[PDB]
Design a protein around this ligand. Sequence first.
Ligand SMILES: CCC(O)(CC)COc1ccc([Si](C)(C)c2ccc(OC[C@@H](O)CCC(=O)O)c(Cl)c2)cc1Cl
Lengths: 240, 11
Amino acid sequence: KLSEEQQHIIAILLDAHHKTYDPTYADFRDFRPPVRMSPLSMLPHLADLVSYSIQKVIGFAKMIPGFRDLTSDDQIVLLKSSAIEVIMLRSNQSFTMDDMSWDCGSQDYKYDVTDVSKAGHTLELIEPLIKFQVGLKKLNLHEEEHVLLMAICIVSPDRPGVQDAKLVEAIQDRLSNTLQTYIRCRHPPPGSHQLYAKMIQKLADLRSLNEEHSKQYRSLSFQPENSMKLTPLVLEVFGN
Amino acid sequence: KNHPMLMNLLK
Ligand SMILES: CCC(O)(CC)COc1ccc([Si](C)(C)c2ccc(OC[C@@H](O)CCC(=O)O)c(Cl)c2)cc1Cl
């Protein structure tokens, strides 16, 4: 039931994800080292981690079918408002539910609830973020559904500042129909609808997590001693 | 504001 257009969209997104995600986490060696034990000892390391992730999300977004047809202003708008959500989505690949942490190779590069707190964030964000990672991990998504959810997350028409909302909607509709057909090719009803309904609910939870992170990022970045430890890309992308 | 680093990463 998967068309040739839908099969090509899936192959491109999987190719894009494989090019923009290194499961070896070798590039973590070049970040500023993590300090677990002034009080925000994990801010430098996690700032480089987010800065690195933003670059990967931009590269992945550029390879989404139809993304380049947008104007530069719309590409910037979609990426500024979705980068935080895609980072939380793509981080699920390293999330393990043994200790509720992101395991990326070593114990140096294994981050838990305390590690996020050593970056300036309260549990008003960390607790819903952990709940999100568990509920997302329990969905047991294929890599095809994972990459389609990331592309649908990026190409959203209801982002503030979007110029050609109809064009963004038309691109998202093709990615959504590709996702709905893939779920039907793998799961009979009514489980197919229940899976797709939970996936869209995760996109709604991302908007809530986006608002909470933005609230705390503004509080942290307003302090010059904290924004001094950020990266130029983070200040440009997360700053508005 | 302008986003020169974002634009450079967007080819
Ligand atoms: C500095 C902004 C600030 O707000 C401080 C002011 C903190 O921000 C954050 C701090 C921690 C997190 Si996080 C959800 C525990 C996380 C992010 C990225 C990760 O990397 C995976 C993958 O992207 C790289 C693999 C690849 O591409 O090869 C992983 Cl595992 C986890 C998110 C944010 Cl936003």
